[PDB]
Structure formats: C-alpha cells, structure tokens
Amino acid sequence: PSRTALSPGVLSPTRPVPNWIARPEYVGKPAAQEGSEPWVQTPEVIEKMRVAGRIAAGALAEAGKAVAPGVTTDELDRIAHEYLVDNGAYPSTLGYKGFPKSCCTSLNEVICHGIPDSTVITDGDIVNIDVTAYIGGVHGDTNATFPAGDVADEHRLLVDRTREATMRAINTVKPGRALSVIGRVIESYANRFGYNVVRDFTGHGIGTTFHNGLVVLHYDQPAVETIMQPGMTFTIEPMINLGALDYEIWDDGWTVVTKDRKWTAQFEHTLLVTDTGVEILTCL
Ligand SMILES: Fc1ccc(CSc2nnc[nH]2)cc1
Ligand SMILES: [Cl-]
Ligand code: NI
Ligand code: NI
Ligand code: NI
C-alpha cells in the first residue's frame, strides 16, 4: 500500500545567496519581465545556457541522489540551493513571483510547484524535483521524478512511461519539424496506457528569461504553426496523470494537486534545436 493524501508542512527560513551572485530582475518584485523575447538565441547566449543547464543538471542529480524514505522535501531544497550557490548560480525559483524556495518538490498527487517544507518522504512515494539555475544572465531548467524505496507497480510504470514519453518527444526535435509533433508524440504514447496529459501547464521557451513567451504544448494540437529552427531553446516537460485532469491549488497559492488525488509524474529538459537535430542543455 502507498501513502494517503498530502497536507502542507512548515517552511524553513529563507536560504541566503551571496551578494556577488547576480539576481534575476524579478527577485523582490511581484511579477517577472518575460514573455516577449526572441525564440532563437545567439551563439554566445547558447554557450552560457550550456553552463546554466549543466549546473541545474548537477543540482537535480545531487538532490535526486538524496531522495529516500525519511528525508524531508526541505532537505532536498537545501542540497539544491547549496549546489547552485557554490557554483555561483542564483536559484531561479527563489523569489520568482514570491515563490519562497530554490526548487519545487512535488510528491505523488502534486502536479507541480510543491514547496519544499517539513514533509517527510516515505516508502512508495514518487518525488519530482524541479530546479532552475540563473547564471551568466540565462536560465537552465530541469526536472525528474524519483522513486523513494519500493514503489507500487502502477506508480513505477507511470514514472517510467513518463520518462520514456519525454525522451521520445526530445528525439523528435529537429529543424523544420512543427513544434506540435512534441505533444502529438507524448499524448499518443500516454493514451496507450489510458493516462491523461496535463494541458493547463506547458513547456516554454527559455533564455535570458525563464518563460520567454514561446509555449510548448504536451498534448496534441496540430493547429499550432510554430516550426523548430536552429538556435531555438525551449523545455519539454510533460505532466502525465493516472486519473483525471481536474486540479485544485492549496491555500499557499502554489501547490497544484489532482482533485481525485491520483498520482502524477513529470520529467523536464531544456533543449537546443541544432542544425541537424537536438542538444540537451541540462545534461551532466
Ligand atoms: F510560477 C512558477 C513557480 C516555480 C517554477 C519552477 S517549476 C517549473 N519548471 N518549468 C515550469 N515550471 C515555475 C513557475
Ligand atoms: Cl509553470
Ligand atoms: Ni511550473
Ligand atoms: Ni522546471
Ligand atoms: Ni520548465
């Protein structure tokens, strides 16, 4: 048997960032300056995003390595935070529209945007950790769902098939392809198992800004005319649900949970469209 429905715990004090680390503009402001930037990056921007992406990948791997029964989500945040700052990177979530931590930790029925807190991870949980680094004036964004101890077959297959859906979408990235093929591949794969792909949350262009206005749908909608072009950088980050798509937000205003409390899994990479195919920027 698995755990029952989560409730919110208490947050640790705000984690400090040394002053020599440049803040993204939106830290300390109610909203962010983003959503109207070019989608294709310059070679110099792409080189800085390789750095940001590899640091984020490091933070995710170190926090992921710690996922185990007994560990709290706040403990995962401390590991991510420290990895980012010791690498000279600002954690993009920290202060983003007031978000109070340095990564999102979303267990079980939490679709996304779980706030690291006193919540204790337990056997059979699935723990998504989503972390973004801001360094060299650019962002790199990545996430993965990690099993804690032995997970029930249905939840283990949900995680594995979500990771496979994500890799299948990434391997469709190639200049000239409609961006829509990503959602077509993800949803067709998910529907084999009777899963539902979340529609209200999407992937996004990313560059000097965290969400540059480019939207990447994870469901099938071929009316979108956008084509993948060399130099474009965006995320693929499908959330796939065992149950229905209906959701609710906690009183904290951030934590997004499935209304029927059935579990959900997500993976995410920041990608570059190259002249021949794709490069994953959030790689170790
Ligand atoms: F409003 C928020 C709060 C936290 C995040 C970081 S999780 C995430 N990574 N790609 C999309 N979302 C993003 C937006
Ligand atoms: Cl989002
Ligand atoms: Ni998000
Ligand atoms: Ni993310
Ligand atoms: Ni993202």
Q: In summary, what is this structure?
A:
Keywords: Aminopeptidase, Hydrolase, Metal-binding, Protease. The chain has helices at 43-65, 73-86, 153-170, 181-191; strands at residues 90-91, 104-107, 110-112, 126-135, 138-147, 196-197, 203-204, 215-216, 233-236, 239-241, 247-249, 256-258, 264-266, 269-273, 278-280.
Keywords:
monomer, 284 residues, alpha+beta, Creatine Amidinohydrolase, four-stranded antiparallel sheet, 15 strands, 21% strand, binds nickel (II) ion, EC 3.4.11.18
Q: Which percent range describes the beta-strand content?
A: 15-25%
Inertia-based shape? globular
**H/E series:** HHEEEEEHHEEEEEEEEEE
Helical percentage = 10-25%
Under CATH, the homologous superfamily reads: Creatinase/methionine aminopeptidase superfamily
Q: What is the third-level CATH name, the topology? A: Creatine Amidinohydrolase
DSSP strand tally: 15
Summarize the biggest pleated sheet. 4 strands, antiparallel
CATH architecture: Alpha-Beta Complex
How far do the termini sit from each other?
Answer: 35 Å
Give the number of helices: 4
Number of domains: 1
Report the CATH C-level class: Alpha Beta
Q: Structural class of the secondary elements? A: alpha+beta
Cofactor: Co(2+); Zn(2+); Mn(2+); Fe(2+)
Subunit structure: Monomer.
GO cellular component, one term: cytosol
GO molecular function: initiator methionyl aminopeptidase activity; metal ion binding; metalloaminopeptidase activity
